Symmetry: C4
Subunit: 384 residues, 4 copies
C-alpha cells in the first residue's frame, strides 16, 4: 500500500521532544561515524535518522578533516550514528530520502564537482541516475523528500553556491524518474530545501546562499506546476541575517543583501507560519522556533509563539522538516516535525575533526517550555 499523504498538515501550538542521539558524547568512547547533514524521514512503521558519514570514526586519525568516502547511512531515530546499528544506503556527499508506503527511496550524489552523479535507490538497490546538467556540484536537499500517492518529489541545484544557479524539481515512481521541471527564479537562489506534504502539494522552504536573508518558498503540484517566491514574514530566518528591527519582508524578492546561509525550515499553518532560526544572527548558535500570524501570506511581524530548543551559548547548525504519516498517528492530518543539527569541532573549536549530533521535535496541541537540549560533548577529544 502507497501512503496517500494528501491530508492537511496539522495546526500545532508547540513542539515536544521526540529524540536526542547524543552521538558525539557516545563517540568519545563508542564506535561512531564522523558525520554531518543528518535528517529524519518516516515510513508507515518507523522514523529513521539518515546521515552523511566521512567514512571515518570519531576519535580516530581518519577523522582528521565532498570526498569519495562519504556515504549515506541510517539508523532508527535517536540511535547514535554508530557503526554496528547502521544501514548502508548510498555513496553520497549530498542526499535525500523518503518512503512511499512500500519501500525507501534514497538519492545519493557523488562523483567529481564538474560532473557529479545522483543515484536513485529504491528498496535498497540502484534504480535510476541523474547526471549534473550544469557542471557545478549537483546537489540536493539534505532532508526528507516527499511522497504523495506513490510518487516522490525532490529538489536539486546545479551551479554556483554564491550567485545565480539552476534549480530543478523531480518526480519518481518506484525509483524511476518520471518527470522533471526547471524552476524559473531569476535573481533568486535555492539550496537545501526543507519540504513536507500539505493538502496534496509539496511545500518547501529553502536556503538563499546568494543575497537573501529571507528564505525561498517553493510549492510543487503533483503535475510539476509550481509557484516560487520568498517566505512573506517580516522576520528573517537565515543566518547570517540582520536585526529584525531593520528588516522588512518580501513575498517575491531576496531581502537583506548578505551572502552565505544555513539550511532551515518552516511550516505553513493555514495562513500563519512556524519558522526556525538560529538565535544568533551572525553564527550557527542557538535554535528557536517562532509562530507568526499571517506569516505565510503577508509581511507580518506578529509573533504569537516562541520556543527555544538550544540556547544561545551552544552550537546549532542545519535544521529540516518531515511529517508523521497517518498510518502511525491515526490522525486526520499530517503531524509536522523538525530536527536540528548541532555541529561540533573545527574551525570554531580546536579539534582536528568536525561532526554533529541531533535533536528531533514534533508538533503537539499544547505549548512546551523553553529549554536547551544541546550537544554536551567535552572538547577537545583524545585524538586532538
Amino acid at each position: 500500500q502507497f501512503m496517500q499523504n494528501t491530508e492537511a498538515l496539522c495546526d500545532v501550538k508547540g513542539f515536544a521532544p521526540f529524540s536526542k542521539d547524543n552521538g558525539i558524547r557516545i563517540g568519545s568512547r563508542g564506535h561512531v561515524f564522523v558525520i554531518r547533514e543528518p535528517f529524519v524521514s518516516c515510513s508507515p512503521t518507523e522514523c529513521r535518522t539518515f546521515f552523511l558519514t566521512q567514512g571515518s570514526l570519531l576519535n580516530d586519525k581518519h577523522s582528521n578533516g565532498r570526498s569519495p568516502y562519504r556515504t549515506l547511512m541510517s539508523v532508527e531515530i535517536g540511535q547514535s550514528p554508530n557503526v554496528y546499528q547502521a544501514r548502508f544506503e548510498a555513496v553520497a556527499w549530498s542526499a535525500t530520502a523518503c518512503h512511499d508506503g512500500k519501500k525507501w527511496m534514497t538519492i545519493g550524489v557523488t562523483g567529481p564537482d564538474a560532473k557529479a552523479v545522483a543515484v536513485v535507490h529504491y528498496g535498497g538497490i540502484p534504480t535510476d541516475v541523474i547526471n549534473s546538467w550544469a557542471g557545478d556540484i549537483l546537489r540536493t536537499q539534505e532532508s526528507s523528500c516527499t511522497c504523495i500517492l506513490g510518487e516522490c518529489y525532490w529538489v536539486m541545484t546545479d551551479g554556483p553556491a554564491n550567485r545565480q544557479a539552476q534549480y530543478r524539481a523531480f518526480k519518481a515512481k518506484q525509483g524511476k524518474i518520471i518527470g522533471q521541471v526547471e524552476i524559473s527564479f531569476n535573481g533568486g537562489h535555492i539550496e537545501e530545501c526543507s519540504c513536507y506534504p500539505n493538502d496534496g502539494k509539496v511545500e518547501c522552504v529553502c536556503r538563499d546562499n546568494w543575497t537573501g536573508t529571507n528564505r525561498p518558498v517553493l510549492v510543487i503540484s503533483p503535475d510539476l506546476s509550481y509557484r516560487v517566491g520568498y517566505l512573506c514574514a517580516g522576520l528573517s530566518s537565515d543566518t547570517p541575517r540582520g536585526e529584525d528591527s531593520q528588516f522588512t519582508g518580501s513575498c517575491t524578492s531576496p531581502v537583506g543583501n548578505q551572502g552565505y546561509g544555513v539550511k532551515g525550515f518552516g511550516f505553513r499553518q493555514g495562513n500563519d507560519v512556524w519558522m526556525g532560526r538560529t538565535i544568533s544572527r551572525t553564527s550557527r548558535s542557538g535554535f528557536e522556533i517562532l509562530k507568526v500570524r499571517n506569516g505565510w501570506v503577508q509581511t507580518s511581524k506578529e509573533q504569537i509563539k516562541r520556543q527555544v530548543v538550544v540556547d544561545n551559548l551552544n552550537r546549532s547548525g542545519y535544521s529540516g522538516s518531515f511529517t508523521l504519516p497517518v498510518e502511525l498517528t491515526k490522525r486526520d492530518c499530517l503531524v509536522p516535525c523538525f530536527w536540528v543539527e548541532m555541529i561540533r569541532g573545527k574551525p570554531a573549536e580546536k579539534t582536528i575533526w568536525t561532526s554533529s549530533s541531533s535533536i528531533v521535535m514534533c508538533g503537539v496541541d499544547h505549548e512546551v517550555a523553553d529549554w536547551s537540549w544541546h550537544d554536551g560533548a567535552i572538547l577537545p577529544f583524545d585524538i586532538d
Copy 2:
C-alpha cells in the same frame, strides 16, 4: 489484539532468577551506557529492560557526574544496556513504559524543573504531552505502567520531594490521554509507584519521601475511582527505616517520622503480601523479599516466607514490579515479577561516575534458596 490483563495475580511461594545483565562488569571494557533507574516491562512476545542513560558511556570522561542528555532506551531482558543493542524510546530524566498488546507506550519526562514536559510515545512516535501542573519537577514511576483491556494507566507527582506534593493518575488509549484524576492524600506522599494489574484493577505500592517509613498503596479502578492509604503490614519496607521491634503498622497514615526513601514494591496475595526491602535499615544495601500473612489488610507481623537476593555486604538500590502476560505463560493468572537495581560508584565509592546493574526474579510455585546475585564489578575503573 489488546491484552486483557483482567486476571488475578498468581499466588506464589517463592521467586526464581529470570535475568542478570552484568552491565557494569561488561562496561569495564565494552561500550555500555552509564544509567540508573532500570525497569522491566513485557509485551505478548518478550520482556525488555528500560533504563535512563546519562548520555555517556562507562569508562569515558563524559561519565563524570536531571540533565538534557538523559534518554530512555531499552534492550531485551538480560542484555547489558549497551550502545549497539539499544532501542531509543524517549528524551527523559524520569520515565515509565508498558505494552497494551498491540504496541509499546512510553512516557519520558524532560525539560526544566519549573516547567517539565512529559511526552507520551506510542509505537515509537510521540502522540501526546502532559506539562507540569505544579511547577516542581513533574515526575513518574521509573517502572512499568499497567495496561488493562487496551487502556494504560500510570502515576505522576509534581511538587516538593520532602513535604506535601500533588499526585495524579492518568489513563491513555493508543497513546492519547483520555482521563485523569487527582489523588487526595493530605499528610501523605507518593513517589515512584510500583504498579501491577490484579483482578481488573491497578495496584501500586509507592515511596513516601516526606515522613513515612512504610509504603503508600494506591488501587485504581478503570474509571479512575481509587483508594489510597498505606501498606497495612506491621513491618516497614522503606529505607531509611527504624527497627521492626519499634514499628507498629498503619493502613491509613505514615509511620516512623523519617525522611528520604527508596523506590520499592509489594504484591497482594489475596489478603497476604510479598514486600521487598533493602536488608540494611540505613543504606541501600542488600535485598530481601518477605511474605506476611494478612499483611495487605491488617498490621500483621506474621512472616511466613523470606528470601534473600543480594546479601547485606553488597549494594542494592531501587526495585519494582511487573507481570508476565498470559499470552506468554498460558496460565490462568498473571505471574508477578520484580527487578532490583544495584547502584555502584559515587558518593559511597571513590569513582567519578555512578551507574547500576540489575537482577530480575519471577514468582514460582516452590520456595527458592537464599543467595546473592550482586553486581560484582571491581572499582575504581580506569577512568577514575
Copy 3:
C-alpha cells in the same frame, strides 16, 4: 507445529566442518565474553551456539579467574560469543537448551552449592523450577536437550563429583515439568550427558567422573522407562584413560579404575558407533572421531573410520552432540552433528583467565580428510 524427531539417525561415513567461531582470536581486540561450556542446538530455522559466560570480557581485569555472574546466552552458530550479538537466556552456571518446534526451552542452574535452583524457561520467560534434591551441586548436560513430539527431555545429577551420586531424567511440555524418573546406577556415575533423538528415543552418552574410563549410556523412552549401562566398545573414550591395548570393554560396568573425566559424546549407527575422544590419554589435547563396527552392542575393537579434527599439539576440551531437524534438511533421517570446545588459558597456560572457542562438524555421506581447526589464539594477552 511441534518437531516430530521420531526418525532414525542417519548413518554417516564422515563429518564435514559446519562452523568455527574464532572467539578467542577475535577477543584479543573485540568485545567477547569469557566463556566455557559452549554447545549447539537447532530449531526449524537455525542452529545456535549457547555458552556460559563468566559475566566478563576477554582482555579486561574482570576476566581474572560457579559464580553468581555466570549466564547462559546464545548467538547464531559460528558467531563469536560477543556482547553485541548475544541473546540472554538464563542465570546459569550449568545449563541445557533445545527447541520443540515452536519455541526454545532453556534450563539454567544457579544458586548455592548446597541448594541450587534450576529455572526452566520457555519462549524467553521462566516457566518452572527444579530445586536440588540431594544438596550437592545440582547440575545438567552442558549440551542440547532432546525434544520428541513436543515433549523435551534432559538429564541432571545431584551429589558428589567423584563417588556415587544421584541421577534423574525429566520430561517437559511447553516449559512445564510433566514427569521425572530416578535412574538406578549403583556403582556408576553420570555427568554431562550428550544426548540426541534416534528412532523415537533419547540416546545419551555421558561422563563417568568416579571410576570409569569408558562412557555411560542411557536410553530413555517417551514414558520415562529407560535402559542404562556403558558404551560396549573395546576402546575407551574418556580422558584420562589408559592405552587401548590394556583396555577391555564392558556393556555393564565402569572399566579402567581412574578418576576425573571430560564431557564427550557418541552416536549409534545401527549396531556400530561413532565416538569422539581427545587424542591425548592424559590431557585435553587433540580431538579424533572413530567409527567402531558393532561398537554399540559388543566390546568390539574393530575400527572402520577415523577422522582428526584438532591435532594433538593443540588444546581441546568438552564435546557434545546435536541433530539437524528434517524441516531444515528435508531428509528422511536426523543428521548427527557434534561440537568441540577448545579451552585456552590457566592453569596450563600463563594467563589470568580461562575461556574457550569452538568448531562444529556435521555427518555427511563421504569421508573427509584429517586436519586441525584449532583455536589459534596467541597467548598471553595484553591483560596478562
Copy 4:
C-alpha cells in the same frame, strides 16, 4: 518461489556507484575483520557482501600475516565486514555463494592442500560435500554463483596454479549436487570464474594463471553442456599483461605468454562486451571498465565506452560480477553489476597485515563520469 533468472542481461551504457564500505578506514578504530576476496550476491530482498576473514581483526596482533581460521561471513551490501553485523556462513579459505529465490546456498572450501573439502550449505546448514579430486588445492570462484530456475551452478579447479590443471562445473538443487561435468581445456587454465545468468545460460569470465593475458570464457547450459574458449576482444584484461598495441586477440587460445593473473570479469552485451581491468599493466593498481564493439564475437579493438572507478595512483585487486534480480528491479532484463576489491598492506606497503575494502557499481542507461572511489586508509596502522 524460485527465481527464474532466464531473462536477457540488460544492455547498459554506463555503471553507477551502488556501495562503498570503507572497511579499512573504519577498522583503524572499529572492530572489523581482516579479509580478502569479498564479493556480492543478491536474493529477492537484498544484496549482501560475502568475504573470507582471516579469523582476526584489524589493528590487533592476530592480523600479523589458506589457514584453518579463515571463514566465510556476510553483511548487507555497503556495511564494513565488522564483527557485530556479520552473519557466519562457512569454514572457508575459498568460497562461492548465491540465492535460488528461496534460500542462500554457500560453498566453503577448507582443509589440507592435498585433500581439501568443499562443504555446500543451504539455508544456513551443511547439506553436501565435494572432496578434492586431484589433490592440489581444490578451489572455487570467490564471487557469486548462478541460479536458474531453482538450480545453482558453479565452477571449481583442482591442480597446479601455474600449469595445466583440472576444471569442473557443478549443478545443485536445494543444496544437493545433482550433476557435474569436466571441462576439457587442454592448453588453457581456469581460475576464479566470474559468472552471471544471461538468456537461460551461465556465462563466466575467468582467470588464466598459466600463460594467458586474455581471459577464459565458459558458457554453461542447464544440462551441463558447455562451450569454452577465450574472450575474443583484441584488448587484454588480465594483470600482468602486455601493451594493447602489441596485443592481438584470440577466441580459442591464450595469448601474451605471461604468468600470474588477477580475478576479473566481463559482461556480454549482445555481440559487444564490457570488460574490467586494472589500469596498470604490471600491478593491481587502478580500475577501468571498457565497452568493446563486437568484443564478445571478434578480435575487435573498437572501444566505444570507458569509465574509470579507481585511479591509477590507488590500489585495486580482484573484481567480479553479479546480477540484480527482477523481483527487486521489476525490469524485463537482469541488471549487470560488479565489485572491485581494493587491497591494502604487505608486501607492497609496510604493514604486518593485508586486507581489502570494496566498491560496487551497477549498470544504468546513461554514461557516468570518471572518478576514484579508492580505499583511503592511511598506513601504517597503530599495530605496525
